[PDB]
Amino acid sequence: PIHLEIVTAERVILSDDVDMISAPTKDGRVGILPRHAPLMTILEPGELDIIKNGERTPFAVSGGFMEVLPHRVTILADTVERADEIDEARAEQARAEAEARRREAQSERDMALAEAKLRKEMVRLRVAQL
Amino acid sequence: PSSREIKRRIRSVKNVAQITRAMEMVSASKMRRAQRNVLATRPYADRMREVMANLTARVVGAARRGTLLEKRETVKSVALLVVTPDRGLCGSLVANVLRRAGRFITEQRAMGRTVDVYTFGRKGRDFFLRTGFAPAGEATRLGDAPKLEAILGVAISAINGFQSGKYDELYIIYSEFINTLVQRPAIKQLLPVESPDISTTTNVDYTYEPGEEEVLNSILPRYVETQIYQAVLESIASEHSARMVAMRNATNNAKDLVRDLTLSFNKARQAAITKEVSEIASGAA
Amino acid sequence: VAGKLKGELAQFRDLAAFAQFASDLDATTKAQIERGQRLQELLKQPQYQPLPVEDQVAVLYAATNNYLDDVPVPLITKWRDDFLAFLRTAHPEVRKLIYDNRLDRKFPTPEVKEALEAAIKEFKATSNY
Amino acid sequence: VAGKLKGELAQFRDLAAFAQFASDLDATTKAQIERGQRLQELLKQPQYQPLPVEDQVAVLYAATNNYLDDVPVPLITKWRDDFLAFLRTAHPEVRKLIYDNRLDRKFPTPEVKEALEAAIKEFKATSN
């Protein structure tokens, strides 16, 4: 019954309501519950746990911070991963990030963007007799 | 003025308008995603902004206010960040940010402090190389939606030099996104002094599990990276808006040129046909 | 049949300057450009090869509906040429059926519609592209 | 000698399109445009100053054989004038040799090739 927010430098991962947090604290793992006492802590490369009515989703956090307040619990984790996509083996998002992304998002754009700059540049000297 | 050479001019300029028409909308499409990326990154910067405000309020001792937050005395050497679009056709945005950086450099040299610049994008990189003031660090070929890892190659070097005493203050010059039509350069302090304009939110205290110093030393490098990441991403959105404005102006200029050339082509053909009937009538008589 | 043909050709001509930038464009814009390119390739015709009215009707019905989308652009002409042979040999009756009711006020019709649909589906299933 | 001159000048006219706008070209294109500028400036002859065949041949040989690459474009004309003065005073014999055997099928004779490149190097050492 505490508002959880997993925010990353690229996007927001999850912002739902959470029962319990098994945070990987630097000195030692701590539990975070609906009305936990105020806290803000560094994380270490580890495996954070979120409990949804008895179900655990390994939101492994490469690292970052976590500010806990009696009202909400924002995850300042600088880098966080997920054991989804067959424990990241399928890496469906990464799969697209490899093809659907990082292949056509910029490389297709860059060649097309540079190509337009060409036929722009060459035509101006071809019309450089007006 | 031969009623055919102007026709080639009309065809060429009409091509230019069509190319610029494509240029205007592709930048606008990338403008939409750049603004979308800015909005997505906003919670990450905003959420930790009050964390600095909360942390800076807790730590007040000058001796323990070490590492990046040290407000160094007798300033000697400041490193400044310039972010520039990789390609041209942006408009006055490239000139404005370089002029803003040039003014800032001259002001500091008047103060007696030596300057250094770290550049993002090729445009800023070549400009300083031609000036003769070689940047110590550069990061070109940045994508339309670059990741935080891309800027780490420059930010880490800036912070390490700051920690080692090579640099005592750190700045950024970025194309601030005011509106879709106005993109003014902006200067921001990177020395992590404090960010309490949010009134430190609730200003709630915390139990620093790794410790006061450890939390401070692990958040300041992250804070400046987020500030650089936002500024570079803001510059990307400002770049596309500036390119969109330049293309829209160019398209209108091209369209005006077409009408101007059309009238000259029209007049030439009437002048030619007036001659064309002239001698044949004269030859007939 | 050809009202949709004319409309799609006009739309593609409106976006003809974006043919070489179709990759980084809207999905609907890319689809329209692809459809226009397929149509222009379809309208390509060799010399001394007249097509009767019923055959052109069948080809245009196949083109307007989403049937040639899977067929690549460079092979649209060969697709059409092979489909004409298929109609001429495999289904001689559908061409006559189209020609007989070409003057009917309601062109689509229910019978001819199913006959031509079945012929097109059979041709596309038997052929590979 | 002038086949390379004509080819390089035409190529430079072709690459003027990239010269006008693009400044990200690699070093080979930069040197290509620089050589084209060298040649086109070298063509900037003044009025009432004709040059005999031997002088033009020697100057074009010096330019095409990369002996003029280090000279900046604004000073190339003065460099050429000084080179003509050098040939008219220091080494008239190389001019006489060049003019004597300008009709040979293979002009770059080793005898012709020497005492000319050496003269070019001597002039380069003398001035700048």
PDB file of all heavy atoms in Angstrom, chain A residues 70-103, unseen atoms left out:
ATOM      1  N   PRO A  70       7.340   7.520   4.204  1.00  0.00           N
ATOM      2  CA  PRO A  70       6.161   6.813   4.713  1.00  0.00           C
ATOM      3  C   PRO A  70       5.011   6.858   3.696  1.00  0.00           C
ATOM      4  O   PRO A  70       4.098   6.061   3.821  1.00  0.00           O
ATOM      5  CB  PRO A  70       5.784   7.589   5.984  1.00  0.00           C
ATOM      6  CG  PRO A  70       6.464   8.933   5.822  1.00  0.00           C
ATOM      7  CD  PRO A  70       7.738   8.636   5.061  1.00  0.00           C
ATOM      8  N   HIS A  71       5.086   7.773   2.726  1.00  0.00           N
ATOM      9  CA  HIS A  71       3.996   7.924   1.724  1.00  0.00           C
ATOM     10  C   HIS A  71       4.306   7.110   0.462  1.00  0.00           C
ATOM     11  O   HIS A  71       3.432   6.323   0.049  1.00  0.00           O
ATOM     12  CB  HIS A  71       3.767   9.410   1.411  1.00  0.00           C
ATOM     13  CG  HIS A  71       5.020  10.159   1.108  1.00  0.00           C
ATOM     14  ND1 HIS A  71       5.541  10.242  -0.169  1.00  0.00           N
ATOM     15  CD2 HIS A  71       5.855  10.859   1.905  1.00  0.00           C
ATOM     16  CE1 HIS A  71       6.645  10.960  -0.144  1.00  0.00           C
ATOM     17  NE2 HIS A  71       6.859  11.353   1.117  1.00  0.00           N
ATOM     18  N   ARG A  72       5.491   7.294  -0.129  1.00  0.00           N
ATOM     19  CA  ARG A  72       5.806   6.602  -1.409  1.00  0.00           C
ATOM     20  C   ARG A  72       7.241   6.069  -1.351  1.00  0.00           C
ATOM     21  O   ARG A  72       7.946   6.382  -0.372  1.00  0.00           O
ATOM     22  CB  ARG A  72       5.618   7.559  -2.591  1.00  0.00           C
ATOM     23  CG  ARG A  72       6.684   8.641  -2.696  1.00  0.00           C
ATOM     24  CD  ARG A  72       7.897   8.197  -3.492  1.00  0.00           C
ATOM     25  NE  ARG A  72       9.050   9.064  -3.299  1.00  0.00           N
ATOM     26  CZ  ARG A  72       9.962   8.900  -2.348  1.00  0.00           C
ATOM     27  NH1 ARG A  72       9.855   7.897  -1.493  1.00  0.00           N
ATOM     28  NH2 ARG A  72      10.977   9.739  -2.255  1.00  0.00           N
ATOM     29  N   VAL A  73       7.651   5.301  -2.365  1.00  0.00           N
ATOM     30  CA  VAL A  73       9.047   4.776  -2.420  1.00  0.00           C
ATOM     31  C   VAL A  73       9.557   4.896  -3.862  1.00  0.00           C
ATOM     32  O   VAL A  73       9.298   3.976  -4.662  1.00  0.00           O
ATOM     33  CB  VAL A  73       9.125   3.330  -1.893  1.00  0.00           C
ATOM     34  CG1 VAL A  73       8.001   2.459  -2.435  1.00  0.00           C
ATOM     35  CG2 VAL A  73      10.483   2.697  -2.155  1.00  0.00           C
ATOM     36  N   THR A  74      10.240   6.000  -4.179  1.00  0.00           N
ATOM     37  CA  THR A  74      10.799   6.191  -5.545  1.00  0.00           C
ATOM     38  C   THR A  74      12.119   5.426  -5.667  1.00  0.00           C
ATOM     39  O   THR A  74      12.912   5.461  -4.704  1.00  0.00           O
ATOM     40  CB  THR A  74      10.999   7.674  -5.880  1.00  0.00           C
ATOM     41  OG1 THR A  74      11.555   8.320  -4.734  1.00  0.00           O
ATOM     42  CG2 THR A  74       9.717   8.362  -6.291  1.00  0.00           C
ATOM     43  N   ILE A  75      12.338   4.766  -6.806  1.00  0.00           N
ATOM     44  CA  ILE A  75      13.612   4.027  -7.039  1.00  0.00           C
ATOM     45  C   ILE A  75      14.520   4.905  -7.904  1.00  0.00           C
ATOM     46  O   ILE A  75      14.245   5.025  -9.114  1.00  0.00           O
ATOM     47  CB  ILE A  75      13.340   2.660  -7.696  1.00  0.00           C
ATOM     48  CG1 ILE A  75      12.223   1.902  -6.974  1.00  0.00           C
ATOM     49  CG2 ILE A  75      14.617   1.840  -7.784  1.00  0.00           C
ATOM     50  CD1 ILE A  75      12.459   1.729  -5.492  1.00  0.00           C
ATOM     51  N   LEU A  76      15.557   5.490  -7.301  1.00  0.00           N
ATOM     52  CA  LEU A  76      16.493   6.371  -8.049  1.00  0.00           C
ATOM     53  C   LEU A  76      17.548   5.494  -8.730  1.00  0.00           C
ATOM     54  O   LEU A  76      18.550   6.050  -9.221  1.00  0.00           O
ATOM     55  CB  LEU A  76      17.144   7.358  -7.075  1.00  0.00           C
ATOM     56  CG  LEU A  76      16.214   8.408  -6.469  1.00  0.00           C
ATOM     57  CD1 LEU A  76      15.263   7.787  -5.458  1.00  0.00           C
ATOM     58  CD2 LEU A  76      17.014   9.532  -5.826  1.00  0.00           C
ATOM     59  N   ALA A  77      17.324   4.176  -8.749  1.00  0.00           N
ATOM     60  CA  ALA A  77      18.293   3.243  -9.368  1.00  0.00           C
ATOM     61  C   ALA A  77      18.796   3.842 -10.684  1.00  0.00           C
ATOM     62  O   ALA A  77      17.980   4.004 -11.612  1.00  0.00           O
ATOM     63  CB  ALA A  77      17.648   1.898  -9.587  1.00  0.00           C
ATOM     64  N   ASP A  78      20.092   4.153 -10.753  1.00  0.00           N
ATOM     65  CA  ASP A  78      20.688   4.731 -11.985  1.00  0.00           C
ATOM     66  C   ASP A  78      20.532   3.718 -13.121  1.00  0.00           C
ATOM     67  O   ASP A  78      20.231   4.142 -14.253  1.00  0.00           O
ATOM     68  CB  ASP A  78      22.151   5.103 -11.747  1.00  0.00           C
ATOM     69  CG  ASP A  78      22.348   5.981 -10.523  1.00  0.00           C
ATOM     70  OD1 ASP A  78      21.340   6.513 -10.016  1.00  0.00           O
ATOM     71  OD2 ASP A  78      23.506   6.125 -10.086  1.00  0.00           O
ATOM     72  N   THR A  79      20.714   2.428 -12.818  1.00  0.00           N
ATOM     73  CA  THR A  79      20.603   1.364 -13.852  1.00  0.00           C
ATOM     74  C   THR A  79      19.842   0.168 -13.269  1.00  0.00           C
ATOM     75  O   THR A  79      20.264  -0.337 -12.212  1.00  0.00           O
ATOM     76  CB  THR A  79      21.991   0.957 -14.361  1.00  0.00           C
ATOM     77  OG1 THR A  79      22.820   0.738 -13.219  1.00  0.00           O
ATOM     78  CG2 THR A  79      22.623   2.003 -15.252  1.00  0.00           C
ATOM     79  N   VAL A  80      18.764  -0.257 -13.937  1.00  0.00           N
ATOM     80  CA  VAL A  80      17.955  -1.416 -13.455  1.00  0.00           C
ATOM     81  C   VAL A  80      17.649  -2.333 -14.644  1.00  0.00           C
ATOM     82  O   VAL A  80      17.478  -1.810 -15.763  1.00  0.00           O
ATOM     83  CB  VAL A  80      16.664  -0.949 -12.756  1.00  0.00           C
ATOM     84  CG1 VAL A  80      15.879   0.031 -13.615  1.00  0.00           C
ATOM     85  CG2 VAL A  80      15.788  -2.121 -12.340  1.00  0.00           C
ATOM     86  N   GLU A  81      17.588  -3.647 -14.408  1.00  0.00           N
ATOM     87  CA  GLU A  81      17.303  -4.628 -15.490  1.00  0.00           C
ATOM     88  C   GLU A  81      16.104  -5.486 -15.076  1.00  0.00           C
ATOM     89  O   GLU A  81      15.551  -5.237 -13.985  1.00  0.00           O
ATOM     90  CB  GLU A  81      18.533  -5.496 -15.762  1.00  0.00           C
ATOM     91  CG  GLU A  81      19.733  -4.707 -16.255  1.00  0.00           C
ATOM     92  CD  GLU A  81      20.357  -3.779 -15.229  1.00  0.00           C
ATOM     93  OE1 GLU A  81      20.247  -4.075 -14.021  1.00  0.00           O
ATOM     94  OE2 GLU A  81      20.937  -2.754 -15.637  1.00  0.00           O
ATOM     95  N   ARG A  82      15.731  -6.466 -15.902  1.00  0.00           N
ATOM     96  CA  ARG A  82      14.566  -7.333 -15.584  1.00  0.00           C
ATOM     97  C   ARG A  82      14.890  -8.783 -15.961  1.00  0.00           C
ATOM     98  O   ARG A  82      15.554  -8.989 -16.995  1.00  0.00           O
ATOM     99  CB  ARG A  82      13.316  -6.832 -16.314  1.00  0.00           C
ATOM    100  CG  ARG A  82      12.041  -7.567 -15.931  1.00  0.00           C
ATOM    101  CD  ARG A  82      11.772  -7.522 -14.439  1.00  0.00           C
ATOM    102  NE  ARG A  82      10.656  -8.385 -14.083  1.00  0.00           N
ATOM    103  CZ  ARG A  82      10.771  -9.679 -13.816  1.00  0.00           C
ATOM    104  NH1 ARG A  82      11.957 -10.261 -13.865  1.00  0.00           N
ATOM    105  NH2 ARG A  82       9.701 -10.392 -13.510  1.00  0.00           N
ATOM    106  N   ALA A  83      14.459  -9.742 -15.134  1.00  0.00           N
ATOM    107  CA  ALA A  83      14.679 -11.173 -15.449  1.00  0.00           C
ATOM    108  C   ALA A  83      13.563 -11.655 -16.379  1.00  0.00           C
ATOM    109  O   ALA A  83      13.330 -12.878 -16.440  1.00  0.00           O
ATOM    110  CB  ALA A  83      14.732 -11.983 -14.178  1.00  0.00           C
ATOM    111  N   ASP A  84      12.892 -10.724 -17.063  1.00  0.00           N
ATOM    112  CA  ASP A  84      11.835 -11.104 -18.038  1.00  0.00           C
ATOM    113  C   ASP A  84      12.505 -11.464 -19.367  1.00  0.00           C
ATOM    114  O   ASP A  84      13.749 -11.525 -19.398  1.00  0.00           O
ATOM    115  CB  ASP A  84      10.788  -9.998 -18.190  1.00  0.00           C
ATOM    116  CG  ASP A  84       9.835  -9.916 -17.011  1.00  0.00           C
ATOM    117  OD1 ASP A  84       9.757 -10.904 -16.254  1.00  0.00           O
ATOM    118  OD2 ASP A  84       9.173  -8.870 -16.863  1.00  0.00           O
ATOM    119  N   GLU A  85      11.711 -11.696 -20.417  1.00  0.00           N
ATOM    120  CA  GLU A  85      12.284 -12.116 -21.723  1.00  0.00           C
ATOM    121  C   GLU A  85      13.182 -13.335 -21.488  1.00  0.00           C
ATOM    122  O   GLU A  85      14.373 -13.268 -21.851  1.00  0.00           O
ATOM    123  CB  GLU A  85      13.059 -10.963 -22.363  1.00  0.00           C
ATOM    124  N   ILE A  86      12.630 -14.391 -20.884  1.00  0.00           N
ATOM    125  CA  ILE A  86      13.408 -15.641 -20.628  1.00  0.00           C
ATOM    126  C   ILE A  86      14.662 -15.284 -19.823  1.00  0.00           C
ATOM    127  O   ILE A  86      15.762 -15.684 -20.243  1.00  0.00           O
ATOM    128  CB  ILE A  86      13.761 -16.348 -21.952  1.00  0.00           C
ATOM    129  N   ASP A  87      14.496 -14.557 -18.714  1.00  0.00           N
ATOM    130  CA  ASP A  87      15.658 -14.138 -17.885  1.00  0.00           C
ATOM    131  C   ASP A  87      16.608 -13.307 -18.751  1.00  0.00           C
ATOM    132  O   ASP A  87      17.833 -13.468 -18.590  1.00  0.00           O
ATOM    133  CB  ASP A  87      16.359 -15.342 -17.252  1.00  0.00           C
ATOM    134  N   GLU A  88      16.059 -12.482 -19.650  1.00  0.00           N
ATOM    135  CA  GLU A  88      16.884 -11.602 -20.524  1.00  0.00           C
ATOM    136  C   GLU A  88      17.516 -12.432 -21.648  1.00  0.00           C
ATOM    137  O   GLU A  88      18.149 -11.827 -22.534  1.00  0.00           O
ATOM    138  CB  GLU A  88      17.946 -10.859 -19.708  1.00  0.00           C
ATOM    139  N   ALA A  89      17.347 -13.758 -21.617  1.00  0.00           N
ATOM    140  CA  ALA A  89      17.866 -14.606 -22.715  1.00  0.00           C
ATOM    141  C   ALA A  89      17.120 -14.247 -24.003  1.00  0.00           C
ATOM    142  O   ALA A  89      17.790 -14.036 -25.033  1.00  0.00           O
ATOM    143  CB  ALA A  89      17.713 -16.066 -22.373  1.00  0.00           C
ATOM    144  N   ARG A  90      15.788 -14.174 -23.940  1.00  0.00           N
ATOM    145  CA  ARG A  90      14.994 -13.756 -25.126  1.00  0.00           C
ATOM    146  C   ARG A  90      15.316 -12.292 -25.429  1.00  0.00           C
ATOM    147  O   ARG A  90      15.467 -11.955 -26.620  1.00  0.00           O
ATOM    148  CB  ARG A  90      13.496 -13.951 -24.865  1.00  0.00           C
ATOM    149  N   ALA A  91      15.416 -11.460 -24.387  1.00  0.00           N
ATOM    150  CA  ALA A  91      15.757 -10.031 -24.574  1.00  0.00           C
ATOM    151  C   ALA A  91      14.934  -9.459 -25.732  1.00  0.00           C
ATOM    152  O   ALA A  91      15.539  -8.872 -26.645  1.00  0.00           O
ATOM    153  CB  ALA A  91      17.237  -9.886 -24.822  1.00  0.00           C
ATOM    154  N   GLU A  92      13.609  -9.627 -25.691  1.00  0.00           N
ATOM    155  CA  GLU A  92      12.742  -9.154 -26.804  1.00  0.00           C
ATOM    156  C   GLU A  92      12.966  -7.652 -27.009  1.00  0.00           C
ATOM    157  O   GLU A  92      13.131  -7.235 -28.173  1.00  0.00           O
ATOM    158  CB  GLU A  92      11.274  -9.453 -26.498  1.00  0.00           C
ATOM    159  N   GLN A  93      12.977  -6.879 -25.920  1.00  0.00           N
ATOM    160  CA  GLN A  93      13.217  -5.414 -26.019  1.00  0.00           C
ATOM    161  C   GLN A  93      14.609  -5.182 -26.613  1.00  0.00           C
ATOM    162  O   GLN A  93      14.722  -4.369 -27.549  1.00  0.00           O
ATOM    163  CB  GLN A  93      13.091  -4.759 -24.643  1.00  0.00           C
ATOM    164  N   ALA A  94      15.621  -5.884 -26.093  1.00  0.00           N
ATOM    165  CA  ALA A  94      16.997  -5.756 -26.628  1.00  0.00           C
ATOM    166  C   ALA A  94      17.012  -6.229 -28.084  1.00  0.00           C
ATOM    167  O   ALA A  94      17.680  -5.578 -28.909  1.00  0.00           O
ATOM    168  CB  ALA A  94      17.957  -6.548 -25.778  1.00  0.00           C
ATOM    169  N   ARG A  95      16.303  -7.322 -28.379  1.00  0.00           N
ATOM    170  CA  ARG A  95      16.217  -7.826 -29.776  1.00  0.00           C
ATOM    171  C   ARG A  95      15.772  -6.673 -30.677  1.00  0.00           C
ATOM    172  O   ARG A  95      16.483  -6.382 -31.658  1.00  0.00           O
ATOM    173  CB  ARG A  95      15.243  -9.005 -29.860  1.00  0.00           C
ATOM    174  N   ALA A  96      14.642  -6.039 -30.346  1.00  0.00           N
ATOM    175  CA  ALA A  96      14.182  -4.871 -31.132  1.00  0.00           C
ATOM    176  C   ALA A  96      15.239  -3.769 -31.028  1.00  0.00           C
ATOM    177  O   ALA A  96      15.559  -3.160 -32.061  1.00  0.00           O
ATOM    178  CB  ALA A  96      12.843  -4.402 -30.623  1.00  0.00           C
ATOM    179  N   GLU A  97      15.781  -3.558 -29.826  1.00  0.00           N
ATOM    180  CA  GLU A  97      16.812  -2.508 -29.617  1.00  0.00           C
ATOM    181  C   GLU A  97      18.006  -2.788 -30.533  1.00  0.00           C
ATOM    182  O   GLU A  97      18.730  -1.830 -30.864  1.00  0.00           O
ATOM    183  CB  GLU A  97      17.241  -2.468 -28.149  1.00  0.00           C
ATOM    184  CG  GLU A  97      18.253  -1.380 -27.849  1.00  0.00           C
ATOM    185  CD  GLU A  97      17.778   0.027 -28.169  1.00  0.00           C
ATOM    186  OE1 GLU A  97      16.551   0.244 -28.200  1.00  0.00           O
ATOM    187  OE2 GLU A  97      18.638   0.902 -28.393  1.00  0.00           O
ATOM    188  N   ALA A  98      18.203  -4.052 -30.918  1.00  0.00           N
ATOM    189  CA  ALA A  98      19.315  -4.418 -31.826  1.00  0.00           C
ATOM    190  C   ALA A  98      18.889  -4.189 -33.279  1.00  0.00           C
ATOM    191  O   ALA A  98      19.700  -3.640 -34.053  1.00  0.00           O
ATOM    192  CB  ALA A  98      19.719  -5.851 -31.588  1.00  0.00           C
ATOM    193  N   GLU A  99      17.665  -4.594 -33.632  1.00  0.00           N
ATOM    194  CA  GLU A  99      17.174  -4.447 -35.028  1.00  0.00           C
ATOM    195  C   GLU A  99      16.212  -3.257 -35.107  1.00  0.00           C
ATOM    196  O   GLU A  99      16.639  -2.186 -35.579  1.00  0.00           O
ATOM    197  CB  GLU A  99      16.499  -5.736 -35.502  1.00  0.00           C
ATOM    198  CG  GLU A  99      15.843  -5.607 -36.865  1.00  0.00           C
ATOM    199  CD  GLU A  99      16.767  -5.212 -38.005  1.00  0.00           C
ATOM    200  OE1 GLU A  99      17.996  -5.187 -37.793  1.00  0.00           O
ATOM    201  OE2 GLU A  99      16.255  -4.929 -39.106  1.00  0.00           O
ATOM    202  N   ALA A 100      14.963  -3.444 -34.666  1.00  0.00           N
ATOM    203  CA  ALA A 100      13.994  -2.358 -34.722  1.00  0.00           C
ATOM    204  C   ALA A 100      14.582  -1.051 -34.207  1.00  0.00           C
ATOM    205  O   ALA A 100      14.109   0.023 -34.592  1.00  0.00           O
ATOM    206  CB  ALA A 100      12.741  -2.723 -33.925  1.00  0.00           C
ATOM    207  N   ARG A 101      15.600  -1.125 -33.354  1.00  0.00           N
ATOM    208  CA  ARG A 101      16.319   0.039 -32.869  1.00  0.00           C
ATOM    209  C   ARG A 101      17.801  -0.141 -33.160  1.00  0.00           C
ATOM    210  O   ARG A 101      18.274  -1.255 -33.407  1.00  0.00           O
ATOM    211  CB  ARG A 101      16.094   0.263 -31.367  1.00  0.00           C
ATOM    212  CG  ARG A 101      14.834   1.044 -31.032  1.00  0.00           C
ATOM    213  CD  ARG A 101      13.607   0.147 -31.047  1.00  0.00           C
ATOM    214  NE  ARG A 101      13.720  -0.951 -30.096  1.00  0.00           N
ATOM    215  CZ  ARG A 101      13.385  -0.871 -28.815  1.00  0.00           C
ATOM    216  NH1 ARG A 101      12.908   0.248 -28.295  1.00  0.00           N
ATOM    217  NH2 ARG A 101      13.532  -1.940 -28.039  1.00  0.00           N
ATOM    218  N   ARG A 102      18.524   0.980 -33.163  1.00  0.00           N
ATOM    219  CA  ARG A 102      19.964   1.016 -33.409  1.00  0.00           C
ATOM    220  C   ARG A 102      20.325   0.522 -34.808  1.00  0.00           C
ATOM    221  O   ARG A 102      21.507   0.434 -35.151  1.00  0.00           O
ATOM    222  CB  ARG A 102      20.721   0.215 -32.344  1.00  0.00           C
ATOM    223  CG  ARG A 102      20.707   0.863 -30.969  1.00  0.00           C
ATOM    224  CD  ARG A 102      21.578   0.109 -29.977  1.00  0.00           C
ATOM    225  NE  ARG A 102      20.991  -1.163 -29.574  1.00  0.00           N
ATOM    226  CZ  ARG A 102      21.558  -2.346 -29.773  1.00  0.00           C
ATOM    227  NH1 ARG A 102      22.729  -2.457 -30.380  1.00  0.00           N
ATOM    228  NH2 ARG A 102      20.936  -3.442 -29.350  1.00  0.00           N
ATOM    229  N   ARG A 103      19.319   0.199 -35.618  1.00  0.00           N
ATOM    230  CA  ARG A 103      19.524  -0.166 -37.014  1.00  0.00           C
ATOM    231  C   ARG A 103      18.772   0.749 -37.965  1.00  0.00           C
ATOM    232  O   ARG A 103      19.340   1.202 -38.965  1.00  0.00           O
ATOM    233  CB  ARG A 103      19.104  -1.626 -37.249  1.00  0.00           C
ATOM    234  CG  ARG A 103      19.683  -2.249 -38.511  1.00  0.00           C
ATOM    235  CD  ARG A 103      18.713  -2.156 -39.682  1.00  0.00           C
ATOM    236  NE  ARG A 103      17.326  -2.309 -39.259  1.00  0.00           N
ATOM    237  CZ  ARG A 103      16.278  -2.038 -40.023  1.00  0.00           C
ATOM    238  NH1 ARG A 103      16.420  -1.595 -41.262  1.00  0.00           N
ATOM    239  NH2 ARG A 103      15.054  -2.215 -39.532  1.00  0.00           N
TER     240      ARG A 103
END
